[PDB]
Ligand binder design. Structure first.
Ligand SMILES: CC(=O)N[C@@H]1[C@@H](O)[C@H](O[C@@H]2O[C@H](CO)[C@@H](O[C@@H]3O[C@H](CO)[C@@H](O)[C@H](O)[C@H]3NC(C)=O)[C@H](O)[C@H]2NC(C)=O)[C@@H](CO)O[C@H]1O
Ligand code: CL
Ligand code: CL
Lengths: 79, 79
């Protein structure tokens, strides 16, 4: 019923918008994606958005780009 | 650098995906949008998605549709 629109993604997951999230001690990608962001992004979307090799290595005090409006969600391909 | 894609929004905010969130006692649209969903949706996007008459009035135990990948965010037009 709504008209289709064309968007230009900034991430492979199709997201156009993002936030900067600074990891806290004890944060993991699963906690960030699933709890802090209430599962609106996949753990592996975050990893690819940040060009991360190992998704289990997250550094306290480092900002991570969180794509917040993905069209698709990759929860485990990088796992 | 990525190629544009065409999507069909299911909500006025441009979102294609959503979740159901069941309001807890004490919940408000503000705390749902800003804390639970970490600002990835606007208070007024939630109100419009659920055809809420009063954005200040939500019912404990009632499920609400949360558009999770809006293109635009409406934080206050309905307030
Ligand atoms: C847009 C926004 O965030 N507005 C905030 C107000 O919603 C909030 O007021 C409180 O709102 C809640 C949710 O509507 C009210 O709780 C509901 O109360 C009714 C009647 O008592 C009850 O039937 C519902 O079960 C119950 N729902 C929930 C989820 O608890 C509550 O009464 C409102 N409180 C006051 C004082 O008006 C106010 C205050 O925090 O802030 C706005 O920003
Ligand atoms: Cl990406
Ligand atoms: Cl809507």
């Amino acid at each position: 019923a709504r008209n289709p629109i064309t968007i230009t993604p900034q991430f492979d997951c199709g997201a156009t918008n993002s936030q900067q999230y600074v990891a806290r001690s004890g944060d993991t990608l699963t906690k960030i994606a699933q709890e802090i962001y209430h599962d609106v992004v996949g753990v592996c979307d975050i990893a690819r958005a940040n060009n991360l090799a190992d998704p289990n290595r997250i550094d306290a005090g480092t900002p991570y780009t969180i794509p917040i409006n993905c069209q698709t969600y990759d929860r485990n391909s990088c796992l």
